[PDB]
Design a protein around this ligand. Structure first.
Ligand SMILES: CC(C)S(=O)(=O)NC[C@H](C)c1ccc(-c2ccc(C#N)cc2)cc1
Ligand SMILES: N[C@@H](CCC(=O)O)C(=O)O
Ligand SMILES: N[C@@H](CCC(=O)O)C(=O)O
Ligand SMILES: [Zn+2]
Ligand SMILES: [Zn+2]
Lengths: 257, 258
């Protein structure tokens, strides 16, 4: 039985309304739940969905060099595969393997409706509206590493701002937008932003273009014998239009705005 | 040793320089893929030679003969070391060659002559006055050939039987066909090529509708090659540093003529 690490992050993996009367894999639903079932069916394996213990995507401690999150679960042998909205990144591909991407995304801006911001450049030129990102993920690293002037400027602000502009979970960022009266903007992946914009209470918006262009991949420990098959499965699912079918199902068929 | 790169004359990816006959070797060519090859070779630490695929094709396996043609075949049969081109990542190809993570996103799209009364694939499928087709030997043809989606299956049943042939040998031929056909030919081609031509004179075509699928171009190497790991890491670094976005803008939008 293959141990799958994943993360609670809507609409990728959510607890079912009736989860308390369900067991095992049946507790959960979402895009990644459906994708896991399809990958396991094409690859011929049984599997156990497990939520990452620390609730993180994965970053490396600069001092100890120890990885956390789903990345660490793979690196240290705690899970066999990560099926999640896990961004393919150079630093991570150095320590784990990724399938070809199953979904495209870019960094984007979430505002409370009516907030006078149209772009990253607008954020970087003003100070009334605070802005930040998730911890231990690929968007914080994007700002930490960018040499593009606007983005460097934003990072200098964010890394020193008080109180802290960073959040532990996507849900914490979204809530901070919603409650901040237009004075907090949240930087997060377009996929999450576009799902949130179609949910009640319908008070947030994506603005501006995306800041980058990248993909999520299925991750395995380096050199795993599962990596080949998983990759071919992703290519097959994409070619059959199954990935587009799931995207519709969990985004746009699930729209309430 | 010097790495032999296979590529294809396809604008704006690889083009002959106006003055190519006065230049030699790699200097004869320009375009997005030319720029990208230089950067992959620098980051991976190799010398290279650009060569244009002899048959002018992307790559497909003959159904009876089982021989791969195009760039894919040059890799499969040992004629080239790497392909740096707008080569779509597909399952059938991944079974015989290796691909990096994609360097560019694309989907199949519709090119019309401006004013043509079509907005969508469904529109094309429900009418007969306007013919439509694809490049005769690439991933777009295969997408229709294999599709189980009703609109697309309907389109393939039309295309495969239409006379005269709605298929073309090169992108350029399809684009010329749209331009000459007074709105009676639509061309099914990748969004990247469509969006490039939309910004070129005579400014008489446009992309219409959403894309039909969502995929990527990858750098390809023969299966199990030693260069594959390094090339993938290069692609990742270049995407993270914004080089690939810069190149896109350089060859599509910075010198757009429309
Ligand atoms: C054949 C498909 C399985 S795929 O490899 O093209 N992936 C599909 C998916 C929708 C996707 C995600 C991400 C990107 C993408 C990533 C990075 C870059 C760059 N540079 C360009 C495109 C392209 C496609
Ligand atoms: N997808 C991201 C997490 C979300 C983000 O950083 O915005 C990762 O894999 O780190
Ligand atoms: N990029 C395609 C060729 C163009 C097309 O089929 O539209 C391939 O790799 O086959
Ligand atoms: Zn399936
Ligand atoms: Zn520490």
């Amino acid at each position: 039985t293959v141990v799958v690490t994943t993360i609670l992050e809507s609409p990728y993996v959510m607890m079912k309304k009736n989860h308390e009367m369900l067991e095992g894999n049946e507790r959960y639903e979402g895009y990644c739940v459906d994708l896991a079932a399809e990958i396991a069916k094409h690859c011929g394996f049984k599997y156990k969905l497990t939520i990452v213990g620390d609730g993180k995507y994965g970053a490396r401690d600069a001092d100890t060099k120890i990885w956390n999150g789903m990345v660490g679960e793979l690196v240290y042998g705690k899970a066999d595969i990560a099926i999640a909205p896990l961004t393919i990144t150079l630093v991570r591909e150095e320590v784990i393997d990724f399938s070809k991407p199953f979904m495209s995304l870019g960094i984007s801006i979430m505002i409370k409706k009516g907030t006078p911001i149209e772009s990253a450049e607008d954020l970087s030129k003003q100070t009334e509206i605070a802005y930040g990102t998730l911890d231990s993920g690929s968007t914080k690293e994007f700002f930490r590493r960018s040499k593009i002037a606007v983005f460097d400027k934003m990072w200098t602000y964010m890394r020193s701002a008080e109180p802290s502009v960073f959040v532990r979970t996507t849900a914490e960022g979204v809530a901070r937008v919603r409650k901040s009266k237009g004075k907090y903007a949240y930087l997060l992946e377009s996929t999450m932003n576009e799902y949130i914009e179609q949910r009640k209470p319908c008070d947030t918006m994506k603005v501006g273009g995306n800041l980058d262009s990248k993909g999520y991949g299925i991750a395995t420990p380096k050199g795993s014998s599962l990596g080949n098959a998983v990759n071919l499965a992703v290519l097959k699912l994409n070619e059959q239009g199954l990935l587009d079918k799931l995207k519709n199902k969990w985004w746009y068929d699930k729209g309430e705005c």
